[PDB]
Amino acid sequence: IIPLQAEETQNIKRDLDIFMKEVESFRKEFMQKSMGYENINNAYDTIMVYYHKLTAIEGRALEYNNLEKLFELQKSNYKQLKDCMNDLKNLKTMWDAIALIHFQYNDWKTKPWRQIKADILLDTNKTLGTQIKNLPKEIRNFKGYNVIVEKVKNMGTVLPLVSALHSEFMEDRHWSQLKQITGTVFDHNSLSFYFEDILALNLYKYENTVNEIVDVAQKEAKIEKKLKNIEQWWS
Amino acid sequence: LKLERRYNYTTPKSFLELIDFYKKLLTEKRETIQRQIQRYEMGLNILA
Amino acid sequence: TTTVTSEDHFMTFYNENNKKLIVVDVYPGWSGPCTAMYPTYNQLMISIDDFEKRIDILLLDQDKLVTYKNDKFHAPKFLFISEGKIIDEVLGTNIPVFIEKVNKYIPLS
Amino acid sequence: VKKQNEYAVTLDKLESDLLQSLSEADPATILDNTELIQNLDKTKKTTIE
Amino acid sequence: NVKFLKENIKSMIGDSLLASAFVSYIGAFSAKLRLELWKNTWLPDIIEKGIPITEGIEPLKILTTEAIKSKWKNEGLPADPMSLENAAIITACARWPLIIDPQLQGSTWIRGKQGENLTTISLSQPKWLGALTSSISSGRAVLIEGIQQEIDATLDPLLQRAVKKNGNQLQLEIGGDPIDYDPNFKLFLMTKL
């Protein structure tokens, strides 16, 4: 009667193990990037589903020992459940990383509104350092994590662009020629919310053009400074 | 260097720039034929 | 944040924050700890309540709340409660630049 | 060497003028077409030459 | 023509190894030694390894055609193996051709092959950095005369075959200020030493 009952419970346990591994994967797959609270709610919601699974998990482990008779199938259904629990714990640490990520993303939007050429350059340096620190910290866990890591990789590229606006090595005439190729409505120094608009133009898709634009600007800033050094000498 | 006074030198960069050149020359040469053979195989399928 | 003056006021601020965490900060790493605790208690309260929305921190005014929480667990001191029950205990101090200690602190279950 | 190079270009030209000519012409025209009979005579001669 | 060309792919895989090996290293050596490296050491070791080399190939035939040898006969390249070999090398060069020419055979032939806008610039020329950087930006070729030994520090960035890609237009950093670099630029260095 132990095995017969055990086979029934194990089959239910495996099904529950799978559903839990689906729910833990779902919370890891879902990237905010911007989105806050609703993600944090989903995590604590998942926390309830796991506690419910651990209870059912117990109600099985009871039924097996009650049966007894040294059945290996009872202990393996348990080995199946413990797997789903660890996967849930992985998803836990994953959602935790996402929250810290949104906090650095939240500090970034505040610095767009703040703007400041001297402030953005310093901000761009430290954020690039912190962002690099987080990505190397990420390792193992489940699958779909690469999806999250690329979002952080996109974040670093924008941090390099902010530092270029900081330097002020490009004029509006330089900003317009690049804007023509870019086809972006926002100029070099349009507004404070321009950090969000710069996102729409893909960092990967529109780094080469902007880099090529920012490089031509620096040569012109140097070329102009010699003309200013020369204009000062004859003046 | 022993037979005449003439000094030659090879570096690991010299080797690394061979492997590059061969890879580049092999693709070019093979791409010239893979084009040439394609014309004939395209044309034989029409003749047949 | 739910500032404590005791192990009673440490386990009370813990039990109050039942959904989130309540990280009791019993004493500090010396070095005028009261002023530094309230200043860190603002930037962490921004990084913990506003930025993360995961944990409160109750800087326990000089008692032995850390030792009593570490006793009640079985598992400066840092007692991380979950529904007013000892879940996480970690001991160790930090000087004025405790951002490294805080980064090192982030984040154990 | 100039004749070997010359003949290679004329054969390469004749090769392409078989591929376009056969494909463009209809099966009813191909049988008694004059241009296709001429090319097959020239290509046989230029290979031997 | 198919079956032969299919055998002419695999055999132009074993060839290219010899050709590449030959162009890269061989060039600094003398007739006797050059011959001992590719005919007495390499070509034998390729037959053992069973790399499908075309039977009887030598660097002359496998690198360059018979038409282009006849072109060089018209530009003062003598028919001796060593000059044809040397000439096949300068053509298919990954690294910049530095040429060791007393008796000025090499120099005269580069003026023949590159007839138009081969601007000859001794390292001792006064505005030589200006003439090179202007020829790099839009020029056919530049022969650098003298250049006995110790190549100037301003050339070291150019001598690096690396060219930096700034979007559409390619721009390499020579001297203090970076200048644009157009494709199909040649840089022959020759040493009367």
From TrEMBL, chain C:
Matching Gene3D superfamilies: Glutaredoxin
Every Thioredoxin domain range: 4-94
SUPFAM superfamilies linked: Thioredoxin-like
Highest taxon of source: Eukaryota
InterPro entries given in the database record: Thioredoxin-like_sf, Thioredoxin_domain, Thioredoxin_H-type-like
Protein name per its UniProtKB record: Thioredoxin
Organism: Tetrahymena thermophila (strain SB210)
Top-level taxonomy: Eukaryota, Sar, Alveolata, Ciliophora, Intramacronucleata
